[PDB]
Amino acid sequence: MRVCVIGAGLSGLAVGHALKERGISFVCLEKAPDVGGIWRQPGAGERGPGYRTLHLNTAKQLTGYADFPMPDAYPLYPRHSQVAAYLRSFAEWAGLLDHVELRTEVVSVRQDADGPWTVVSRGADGAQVSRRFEQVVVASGHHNEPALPDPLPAGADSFAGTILHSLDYRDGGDFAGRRVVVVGLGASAVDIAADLSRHAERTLLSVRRGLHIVPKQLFGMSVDEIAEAPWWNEMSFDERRRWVEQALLVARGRLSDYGLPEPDHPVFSSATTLSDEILSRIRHGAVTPKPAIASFDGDRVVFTDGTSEPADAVVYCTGFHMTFPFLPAGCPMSADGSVELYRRVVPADRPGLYFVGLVAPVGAITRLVEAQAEWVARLVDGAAVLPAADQMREEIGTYLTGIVQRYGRTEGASIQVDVGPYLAEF
Ligand SMILES: Cc1cc2nc3c(=O)[nH]c(=O)nc-3n(C[C@H](O)[C@H](O)[C@H](O)COP(=O)(O)OP(=O)(O)OC[C@H]3O[C@@H](n4cnc5c(N)ncnc54)[C@H](O)[C@@H]3O)c2cc1C
Ligand SMILES: NC(=O)c1ccc[n+]([C@@H]2O[C@H](COP(=O)([O-])OP(=O)(O)OC[C@H]3O[C@@H](n4cnc5c(N)ncnc54)[C@H](OP(=O)(O)O)[C@@H]3O)[C@@H](O)[C@H]2O)c1
Ligand SMILES: CC(C)=CCc1ccc2c(C[C@H](N)C(=O)O)c[nH]c2c1
Numbered sequence: 001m002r003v004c005v006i007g008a009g010l011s012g013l014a015v016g017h018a019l020k021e022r023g024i025s026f027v028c029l030e031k032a033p034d035v036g037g038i039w040r041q042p043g044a045g046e047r048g049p050g051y052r053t054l055h056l057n058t059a060k061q062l063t064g065y066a067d068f069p070m071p072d073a074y075p076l077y078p079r080h081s082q083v084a085a086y087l088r089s090f091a092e093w094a095g096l097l098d099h100v101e102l103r104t105e106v107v108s109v110r111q112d113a114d115g116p117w118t119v120v121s122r123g124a125d126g127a128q129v130s131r132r133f134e135q136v137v138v139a140s141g142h143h144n145e146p147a148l149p150d151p152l153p154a155g156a157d158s159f160a161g162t163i164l165h166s167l168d169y170r171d172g173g174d175f176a177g178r179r180v181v182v183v184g185l186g187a188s189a190v191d192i193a194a195d196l197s198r199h200a201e202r203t204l205l206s207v208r209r210g211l212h213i214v215p216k217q218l219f220g221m222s223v224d225e226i227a228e229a230p231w232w233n234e235m236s237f238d239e240r241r242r243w244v245e246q247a248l249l250v251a252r253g254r255l256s257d258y259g260l261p262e263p264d265h266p267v268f269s270s271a272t273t274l275s276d277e278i279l280s281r282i283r284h285g286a287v288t289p290k291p292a293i294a295s296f297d298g299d300r301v302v303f304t305d306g307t308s309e310p311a312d313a314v315v316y317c318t319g320f321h322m323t324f325p326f327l328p329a330g331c332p333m334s335a336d337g338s339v340e341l342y343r344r345v346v347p348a349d350r351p352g353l354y355f356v357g358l359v360a361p362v363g364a365i366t367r368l369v370e371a372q373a374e375w376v377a378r379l380v381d382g383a384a385v386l387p388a389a390d391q392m393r394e395e396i397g398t399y400l401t402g403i404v405q406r407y408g409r410t411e412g413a414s415i416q417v418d419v420g421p422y423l424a425e426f
Contacts (some may be wrong), residue, residue: 001025003380004119004131006106006326007139009037009374010087011357011369014065015137016096018373024381028096031105035091037141040084042170049143049188049320052171052241053195054080057187057274058364065090066370071361076222079237106326109136111350135352135380138324141356142415145321149183153293160299161312166192169315179310181301183293184317185211186271187258192317197286204301204309205278208292210261212272213279218247222364223274233420242312259289260281270407276315283297322358322412336399338403338414340396343425345372346379354379360412361419368419371426 005015008030012291019026034040041048055077056063064070070086078086091097101121105420107128108120111334120130146165156163172195181204189205190213196203214223226232232240244267256262258279263270281287293314295302301311324330332347333338342348344359354376357369378384387394400414407413 001027002134002334003027003137004029004106004117004133004135005137005139006109007037007141008032008035008091008100008102009139009141009357010039010366011037011141011373012137012139013087013091013094013096014366014369014373015139015376016099017094018066018370018377019380020095020099022377022381024377026099028100029104029106029119030100030102033103034084034088035097035100036087037078038143039087041080042085043081045170047167047170047386049167050080051166051169051188051192051195052080052173053191056083057216058224062222062224062228063364063366065366068093096302106140108328109138109326110328111320111352115352117352132299135354137354137356137376138327138358139356140324140326141321143320144325145323146316147319147321148316149318156295156299159296159314161314163296163314164316164318166256166315167320172196175200175313177201178312181206181290181293181311182287182317183314183315184319185209185213186273186317186319187275188319190273190275190318192235192315193287194275194277196280196315197281202309203281203284203287204290204311205287206293206301206303207261210255211270212248212263212267213252213255213260214244214248214272214274215251216268216274216276218251227363227419236267241268241272244268249359252279261291270410288318298413319412322415327336331358334400334414336409338400340393342386342392342395344399344415344417344422345376346386346392348389348396351386358415359417359422360415361417361422363419367423369418371423375426 002024003026005012005026005028008028016028038048038050042050042052049278059076060074066247068090103124105122107122110118112118116132116137118132122128146167165338173335176199179202180196180200183206185207192208193205270315293301294304298309302308334340341355347353356372359368403413
């Protein structure tokens with residue numbers, strides 16, 4: 001009645017918990033047959049950003065909800081199925097599921113001239129019902145639309161095999177004995193290449209721009225555990241860079257010597273891909289680093305180095321586009337494509353709309369959405385207040401002009417957040 005929460009992944013669940021703890025009435029509308037967001041999608045053979053080898057790359061005690069620790073027997077890096085079971089178990093404990101409408105997909109969201117939002121959902125029956133809510137919290141995730149490169153390499157339409165995205169990818173088993181090209185050097189790409197490296201006859205890793213490939217662990221410490229260590233925050237943002245790049249070279253050496261393009265920037269600058277596997281896979285010949293794909297010649301994939309390989313499939317791990325089809329005008333955005341959300345949550349012109357989980361921190365997103373949810377709940381029932389709109393576009397302004405200072409234009413830096421200072425403001 002008061003709050004329609006769109007999404008029952010980790011963020012929607014935190015919002016529902018936050019609202020339930022303030023006595024605030026809400027319903028949570030979720031597409032999938034259950035809660036958990038992406039973490040339950042592999043496990044149901046569902047097409048989504050995950051895959052059957054997906055584990056957390058953040059430590060469990062930093063990723064679990066603050067008031068609801070993951071089972072003690074869980075490893076540091078739980079499998080997607082353990083996370084999904086954890087999330088379902090959270091919804092049960094927090095008393096959330098009777099406020100959750102499963103198999104219910106939100107299709108339009110419009111602000112009515114009196115303040116309330118009209119929300120049109122489509123259910124199992126394919127039927128549609130239109131409802132009014134005081135406020136709407138968007139918790140729909142930002143891995144919604146696959147982002148293929150533009151353009152495809154030439155000859156893609158004549159390709160003998162399957163051109164697919166990591167969305168359509170679930171299990172390397174589905175490629176047993178086949179010759180597959182993985183495109184990308186991000187979390188998805190190295191994981192899916194690693195996974196193909198034990199079922200495919202041959203796995204090729206086609207990379208164009210170089211990324212810093214960091215183990216999940218230095219000094220035995222998870223990289224996001226170190227990020228919190230006082231002695232690391234004790235350190236200067238150049239003293240740490242050197243610490244990291246010296247540590248990296250003791251642990252893996254230099255990327256060029258694994259056949260990988262060396263990045264054009266230090267660590268932190270741009271982005272870092274986490275993997276314990278992909279370098280070793282290369283050194284074992286299980287994955288073969290290749291340059292960029294330049295053309296598809298029938299059954300073969302031709303690379304920019306003139307070399308060529310027969311390939312039965314190409315798996316594009318080029319990331320995801322952030323879209324909001326149910327929002328007619330869409331996430332408040334800048335011409336540049338930069339998100340414009342006051343403190344990464346709040347549109348400046350539309351009262352009663354909130355975006356939760358649309359941040360990208362170094363490490364786990366959980367503490368951040370827990371703080372976001374707690375703030376939004378206090379805004380919904382009035383314990384907290386927003387600046388005037390101009391003043392909200394000013395925080396947006398200095399946050400944005402500050403991300404160009406750190407990442408220049410990039411493309412998805414408009415949701416990047418320092419996990420330390422952000423949480424401190426809550
Ligand atoms: C491959 C991968 C690995 C990751 N690994 C980590 C990690 O190790 N650690 C970490 O902290 N984070 C990780 N993340 C980040 C991850 O996004 C979050 O950890 C977590 O999934 C929180 O997501 P969420 O709840 O905001 O959204 P999601 O998990 O995407 O859930 C959003 C929900 O919106 C629902 N929805 C309902 N109605 C609609 C509608 N009408 N339109 C659209 N959607 C709708 C979808 O069904 C979905 O369930 C990873 C992400 C990816 C893609
Ligand atoms: N869990 C984590 O640690 C983590 C970290 C960061 C992001 N994520 C999320 O996970 C999602 C999955 O993507 P990912 O991070 O695994 O991979 P990614 O970082 O999005 O993929 C990087 C690769 O994109 C390729 N690329 C080049 N031009 C491109 C273009 N115009 N459009 C798209 N891609 C282009 C580059 O080489 P090629 O052209 O050779 O492929 C590059 O190696 C992302 O969307 C992100 O939101 C998760
Ligand atoms: C000390 C050091 C080099 C840290 C580098 C680092 C650590 C964690 C992450 C994550 C976590 C989570 N998977 C997310 O995407 O929210 C993404 N990128 C990261 C980079």
